């Protein structure tokens, strides 16, 4: 039923941020937030 679970997950409209990755030569971590004009920056997700 994992397939049914993912089907019911994908039934909903979705949005994504895309990233293109370039080597840096170290151990980097990114902190990503959304900035609205009429609000304060709010953290989104975690990545490195």
């Amino acid at each position: 039923q994992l397939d049914h679970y993912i089907d019911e997950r994908r039934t909903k409209d979705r949005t994504f941020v895309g990233l293109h990755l370039q080597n840096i030569g170290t151990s980097a971590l990114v902190i990503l937030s959304i900035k609205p004009k009429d609000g304060d920056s709010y953290e989104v997700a975690k990545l490195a």
Binding site: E8, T11, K12, D13
Partner: protein, 48 residues
């Protein structure tokens, strides 16, 4: 047609007094044209 009526938000489902959270999520009018996210599917699409 009636685009102003559509941009109008539905009531009283908008207010937080509604225990059901799905109505608060979908208080709009445009999204309702698709029932993918509503979660209920009719078994048969025939007519007698």
């Amino acid at each position: 047609c009636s685009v102003e009526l559509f941009r109008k938000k539905l009531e009283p489902f908008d207010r937080d007094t509604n225990p059901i959270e799905l109505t608060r999520t979908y208080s709009t009018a445009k999204s309702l044209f698709s029932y993918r996210q509503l979660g209920y599917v009719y078994d048969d699409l025939s007519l007698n």
